[PDB]
Amino acid sequence: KVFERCELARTLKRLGMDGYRGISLANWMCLAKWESGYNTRATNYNAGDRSTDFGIFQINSRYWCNDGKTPGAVNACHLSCSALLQDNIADAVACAKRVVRDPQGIRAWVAWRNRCQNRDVRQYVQGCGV
Ligand SMILES: [Cl-]
Ligand SMILES: [Cl-]
Ligand code: NA
Numbered sequence: 108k109v110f111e112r113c114e115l116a117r118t119l120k121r122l123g124m125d126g127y128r129g130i131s132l133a134n135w136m137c138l139a140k141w142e143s144g145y146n147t148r149a150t151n152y153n154a155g156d157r158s159t160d161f162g163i164f165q166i167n168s169r170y171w172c173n174d175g176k177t178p179g180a181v182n183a184c185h186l187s188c189s190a191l192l193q194d195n196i197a198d199a200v201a202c203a204k205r206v207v208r209d210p211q212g213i214r215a216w217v218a219w220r221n222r223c224q225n226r227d228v229r230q231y232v233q234g235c236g237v
């Protein structure tokens with residue numbers, strides 16, 4: 108599923124993402140925008156280390172979900188990576204919450220540092236009623 112901007116904003120708020128571990132909703136929106144373009148079925152194989160990024164938040168198989176083919180991988184979200192390719196983003200949000208519960212927080216995603224950190228991210232939630 109490819110979410111429309113405001114549709115996703117309202118959905119994440121309902122799932123309790125606004126202010127989770129100090130992270131505002133607009134930051135989550137900025138992250139989803141740059142990671143997958145709000146696309147739940149986006150997949151990206153990282154040839155360099157044999158891992159794959161899955162779904163709307165592009166969560167990595169080396170630490171967060173199990174796809175069975177990633178060398179030396181753990182499954183912290185205790186989910187099959189398939190769960191992060193569904194149209195319903197409930198499991199993906201629960202896993203994103205687990206990621207930021209680690210010391211790095213939102214910084215775990217390099218794309219956030221490049222495109223969201225220290226930026227005016229208000230544009231991502233403007234006019235959405237959230
Ligand atoms: Cl699962
Ligand atoms: Cl599994
Ligand atoms: Na894994």
